[PDB]
Amino acid sequence: KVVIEPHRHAGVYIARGKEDLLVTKNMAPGESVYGEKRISVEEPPTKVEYRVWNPFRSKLAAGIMGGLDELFIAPGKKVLYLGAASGTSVSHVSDVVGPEGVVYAVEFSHRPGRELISMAKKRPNIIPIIEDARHPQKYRMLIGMVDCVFADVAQPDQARIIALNSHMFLKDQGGVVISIKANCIDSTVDAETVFAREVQKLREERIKPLEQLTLEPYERDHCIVVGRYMRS
Amino acid sequence: GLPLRNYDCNSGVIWSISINDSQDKLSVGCDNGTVVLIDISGGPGVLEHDTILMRQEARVLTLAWKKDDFVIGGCSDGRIRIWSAQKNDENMGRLLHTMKVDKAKKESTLVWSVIYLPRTDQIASGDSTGSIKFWDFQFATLNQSFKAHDADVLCLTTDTDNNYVFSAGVDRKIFQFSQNTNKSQKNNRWVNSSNRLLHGNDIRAICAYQSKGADFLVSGGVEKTLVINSLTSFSNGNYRKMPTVEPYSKNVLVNKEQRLVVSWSESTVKIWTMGNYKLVCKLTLKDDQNISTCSLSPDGQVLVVGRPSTTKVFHLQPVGNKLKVTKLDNDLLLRTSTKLVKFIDNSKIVICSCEDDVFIVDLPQEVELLEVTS
Amino acid sequence: KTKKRKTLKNLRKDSVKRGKFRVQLLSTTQDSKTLPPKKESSIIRSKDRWLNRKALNKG
Amino acid sequence: FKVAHLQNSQTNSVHGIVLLQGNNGWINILHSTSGLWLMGCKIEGVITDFCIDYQPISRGKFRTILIAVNAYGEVWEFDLNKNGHVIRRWKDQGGVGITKIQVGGGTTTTCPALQISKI
Amino acid sequence: TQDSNYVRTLRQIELKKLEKGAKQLMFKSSGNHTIFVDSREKMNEFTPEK
Amino acid sequence: MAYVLTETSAGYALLKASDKKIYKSSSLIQDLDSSDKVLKEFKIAAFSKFNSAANALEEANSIIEGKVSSQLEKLLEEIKKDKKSTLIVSETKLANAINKLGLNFNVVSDAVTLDIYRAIKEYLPELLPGMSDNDLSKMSLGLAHSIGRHKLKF
Amino acid sequence: EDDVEYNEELDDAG
Amino acid sequence: NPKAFPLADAALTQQILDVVQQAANLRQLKKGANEATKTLNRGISEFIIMAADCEPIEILLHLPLLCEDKNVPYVFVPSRVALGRACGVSRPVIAASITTNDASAIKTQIYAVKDKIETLL
């Protein structure tokens, strides 16, 4: 049988054995949200269904394979997911937080939004918010304070979007995880130069960067920046 | 005199900056061919990302505004581009027209300067070939072409009434294009009235101003000096060449005792002694911020270097016709901004901070200052 | 001589390679605020190279 | 090239003009007899073809219009009696790779006039 | 035409097989991982194990 | 007197701030870091609970648009007896809308007030006696779906 | 002038 | 035509239509929305050109959904008639696709226009 083993970050597992894959526990067992392979293993023995996390589809999973030192996403924590195109990665984030935690999925485009809503019904701990992340004041009601802010928004002015949301809904000393696509921001200059600018812009917004990781080979011209929100 | 706000354009390196007529938005031209509108109507120190105009592959070397509706940009591929900045319109942020200047056969063509002429509804452009071209805005078509300069045209300007267009560039000449005559105005034709050679090197910047009591055409460039002319009487009027250095703020001091001459420039302090002169000592400072002022004690032992960021004190000891330097440590001075600094005696100093706080340090005893009516 | 210059260079280095990880120093906030950011040499050099190109024959 | 008739309005005299195709959207207009360069017209894109149209004004008066088309299909109309200033712009609907343009039903190179009244 | 149809069907099957298989496999990351420390001394004494 | 208008998935919460000019204090963060101090500084004035999801959706949409709802003005009207008071509103759009209503409230919306709201909503479940954190989450989830269906024109 | 030269950072290092 | 987004300008449309004409001569062009839909499924499409005045526009609006899924650049040109004539047919063409070929004689020009569409997205 496949030997699923624990991982550094709580709520994440690896189905070690023959075919070793990054894996998370399923909140709504018996179904896959985007057709991912599902593994069930008896543990004393009761079977617990698990979902595969594909790094090439989710940039957050590419961070795990890269070996991010600190992830503020963990069981029993509220997370604000900006740029939640669909349930591809939010569902796994919903898995990690578990029933106790909640995930605030923010999306703007309507067509993927309807896909997000259909997924949210299966997952009670996901609160879908169909609104522009550029104006957080609109959806302030539906969101409480958040331990971590994860952003996959591919916009040139993304650093402003993180600041407004972080200034509003992120707790002091909270989490900030940003996935950066340098091509959107500046294609003329190399990726390293673009990433340096993004770190600087975050510092101006009272976010201390902790670590940075390139996502190769999973994605080209991408990196994940992890920081802490120090209001003081 | 410090940066109130540092705002990132969220794009490639900036080449040009301009402001619209209502003075509420900044248009910023980038190396990656992007033009970014930055809203500044919030207030002083407030800058916000408004919109990004439609992208293209050529560096935007210069920008101009037609009221608050259109953005005109000269590009490094030899083309002039008009974007629509009109809000509440479907064409917002779209590239309405593209105009191409005559291109050098054996060289790249760069549209260095572009301006808008409200009276005639035209665009005046200068390129690297030395040509000045007048384009009809509504049709985006060429009206006139002048092969005036022998090299790049780097800057353009116009008078209040758009009766005169002044161009300058690498060839050190300033050309006057006039449409003052009524017959010229009716036909909408410009005339290459005259040119003048006033600069010893390239002319990078030119600007014009007119009021009921003022008439200035100010130019400067690689020569490092200003040249002042009259717009209306440019052809015949007198001109003034300002001094290269006018020491309103002194960069050099001399100590009567020890006969020392001290000069500071670009974080570097040199000390000379004259009996006929010898360079006793040179000090190299680390901080990028340049030295604003330096003060030497009457005895000459204590040297104080003041910068807006920090103030550092160095003790000077004469050894073997040379000066031995040791950095006296004073945390208050290191954390203090120094606009002006003066010695009371060999020990005590008066320091005026960038915030207008006058206090005395013995090597803070704050000094009361009368308020000033706003 | 040159070693003194290289030793000076080594001190003015805000990153270090610790194996597969490169640790980089973060400058003080006052430095960014007190003074505007440095110019990129490539962009400014291109303009100055152009204005002093051979075809002008400035001499 | 093509040859047309230009009326100098301020003297009411009429003379011929030779129209040429330039390298960059340029149309150069010369005096037919003296060979002097009178005016030039510019369009965006690559000039492909042009034609001349006459518009009568009054007894003994007419104006010459230069119609130039770009390979994309955009058409310029210049008023050669007013220093070659554009007076109209429009696009050939569904036009791409335009190769020629011509006018008919009135005076032209193929049906030139013999006196002013026949324009 | 039928030969073109036959080979394309084979090519389509192989593409789908490749997509399914690659999902099963896990690829080790090869990317730079920089860490930021505020003090110059913390850099010099930095150790990955610590 | 100083007031803070707070909006929640359950209803409108109106808070008396003890200090008239609490939003011009630079110590707000340490002043409000724990729930207990929030309780003394802010006391519940009135709570208009959303009776049904349909009312909640209408109330949710109006506040998104920056419009003063019928339930909001009633709750605001109840405090009108207090002469020359200050209302702290998170939004400039909502503050101006309340300003247009002609109440005797000096409405204030400042970046400093964000700290007040930040402390309030963090400890909201403890601030609001009777609703658990779980129940508040369930209110948002149902309301979130309802507003989402409206935005998508379902 | 290297004989009389003084560098602050070299002094700071040692 | 707000749904037609992004829409190429006059300067860029000439460059696109030039490539479409050259591709037609080399038989590297697929004409019609249905064929453009197929090439996306087979993953052999360099980029997709679409006509803005196509009425109703929705008949071609499925192609952007496929293109963004497959990471394929796409762009709109104002006229379907001009696209059809550029393609080299007697009918208005609302959509077209440039088939991939690394041994083509017009490889450089396709990638040149491809980048401008990528920047324009």
The pair of three-digit structure tokens given for residue B137, joined into one six-digit string:
């805005």
**Gap between the Cα atoms of D103 and D51, Å rounded:** 7
Q: Which residue of B has its CA nearest to D74?
A: B139
Strand, helix or coil for residue B203: strand
Instruction: Find, among H67, A54, H41, A93, the residue nearest to E20 by Cα.
Output: A54
Helix (H) or strand (E) holding C56: none
**Gap between the Cα atoms of B270 and B261, Å rounded:** 8
Q: Which amino acid is at A168?
A: M
Which of B106, B152, B338 has the most C C-beta neighbours within 10 Å, making it the best mutation to test the interface with C? Answer: B152
Helices (DSSP H) in chain F: which residue ranges? 28-31, 35-41, 53-65, 70-78, 92-100, 113-122, 124-127, 133-151
Taking the CA of residue B40 and the nearest CA in chain D, the distance in Å comes to 36
Asked if B32 contacts B52 with a C-beta cutoff of 8 angstroms, the reply is: no
Pairing assessment for the beta strands B164-169 and B153-158 based on DSSP bridges: antiparallel
**Gap between the Cα atoms of A11 and A96, Å rounded:** 4
Chains A, F: CB pairs < 8 Å: 66
Q: What are phi and psi of H4, to 5 degrees?
A: -65, 100
Chain D contact present for H82, CB below 8 A: yes
**Gap between the Cα atoms of B262 and B303, Å rounded:** 10
Chain C contact present for E33, CB below 8 A: yes
The alpha carbon dihedral of A23, A26, A32, A37 has a sign of positive
User: Cα torsion at B231, B237, B240, B241 (round to 10°)?
Assistant: 80
Pairing assessment for the beta strands B215-221 and B226-229 based on DSSP bridges: antiparallel
Chain H contact present for D97, CB below 8 A: yes
Chain C contact present for E30, CB below 8 A: no
Which of B55, B77, B80 has the most H C-beta neighbours within 10 Å, making it the best mutation to test the interface with H? Answer: B55
Chain H contact present for D93, CB below 8 A: yes
Q: Which residue of B has its CA nearest to C42?
A: B13
Q: How many CB atoms are closer than 10 A to CB B181?
A: 12
Asked if A52 contacts A122 with a C-beta cutoff of 8 angstroms, the reply is: no
Chain H contact present for E8, CB below 8 A: yes
Interchain CB distance below 8 Å, B10 and A185: yes
Interchain CB distance below 8 Å, B6 and C33: yes
Taking the CA of residue E12 and the nearest CA in chain H, the distance in Å comes to 8
DSSP B102: P
Q: Which residue of G has its CA nearest to C1?
A: G2
DSSP F24: G
Of B282, B285, B286, Cβ closest to residue G4: B282
Taking the CA of residue B348 and the nearest CA in chain G, the distance in Å comes to 24
**Gap between the Cα atoms of A102 and A116, Å rounded:** 15
Using a threshold of 3 CB pairs under 8 A, tell whether chains E and F touch.
no
Q: What are phi and psi of B225, to 5 degrees?
A: -130, 150
**Full residue range of the structural domain in which residue H47 is found:** 1-121
Helices (DSSP H) in H26-88: which residue ranges? 33-42, 62-70, 80-87
Chain C contact present for A186, CB below 8 A: no
Rounded to 5°, angle at Cα F58 from F57 and F64: 85
Asked if D4 contacts D16 with a C-beta cutoff of 8 angstroms, the reply is: yes
Chain B contact present for G14, CB below 8 A: no
The pair of three-digit structure tokens given for residue F137, joined into one six-digit string:
């989450």
Q: How many residues does chain D have?
A: 119
Give chain H positions within 8 Å (CB) of E12: 42
Q: Which amino acid is at G9?
A: E
Which of B56, B88, B90 has the most H C-beta neighbours within 10 Å, making it the best mutation to test the interface with H? Answer: B56
Resolution (A): 3.2
**Gap between the Cα atoms of G5 and D72, Å rounded:** 68
**Gap between the Cα atoms of B356 and A91, Å rounded:** 58
Interchain CB distance below 8 Å, F152 and A232: no
Chain C contact present for B85, CB below 8 A: no
Give chain H positions within 8 Å (CB) of D46: none
Interchain CB distance below 8 Å, H79 and D72: no
Asked if F8 contacts F124 with a C-beta cutoff of 8 angstroms, the reply is: yes
Rounded to 5°, angle at Cα C11 from C9 and C14: 95
User: Cα torsion at F121, F123, F129, F130 (round to 10°)?
Assistant: 80
DSSP state string for F80-116: TTSSSEEEEES-HHHHHHHHHTT-SEEEE--TTHHHH
The pair of three-digit structure tokens given for residue B27, joined into one six-digit string:
């248009």
Q: Which residue of C has its CA nearest to B110?
A: C50
DSSP C40: P
Q: Which residue of H has its CA nearest to B98?
A: H11
Which of E29, E30, E40, E45 has the most C C-beta neighbours within 10 Å, making it the best mutation to test the interface with C? Answer: E40
Pairing assessment for the beta strands C21-25 and E33-37 based on DSSP bridges: parallel
The pair of three-digit structure tokens given for residue B150, joined into one six-digit string:
């022998």
Give chain H positions within 8 Å (CB) of D73: 82
Residues D60-99: b if buried by 16+ CB within 10 A, e if exposed: eebbbbbbbbbbbbbbbebbbbebbbbeeeebeeebbebe
**Gap between the Cα atoms of H90 and H78, Å rounded:** 18
Rounded to 5°, angle at Cα F53 from F49 and F54: 110
Asked if D1 contacts D20 with a C-beta cutoff of 8 angstroms, the reply is: yes
Q: Which residue of A has its CA nearest to B34?
A: A186
Strand, helix or coil for residue D16: strand
Which of H42, H44, H100 has the most E C-beta neighbours within 10 Å, making it the best mutation to test the interface with E? Answer: H42
Domain count of chain H? 1
Q: Which positions 18-47 of D are in contact with H (Cβ < 8 Å)?
A: 45
Give the CATH number of the domain where residue H71 resides.
3.30.1330.30
**Gap between the Cα atoms of B190 and B178, Å rounded:** 6
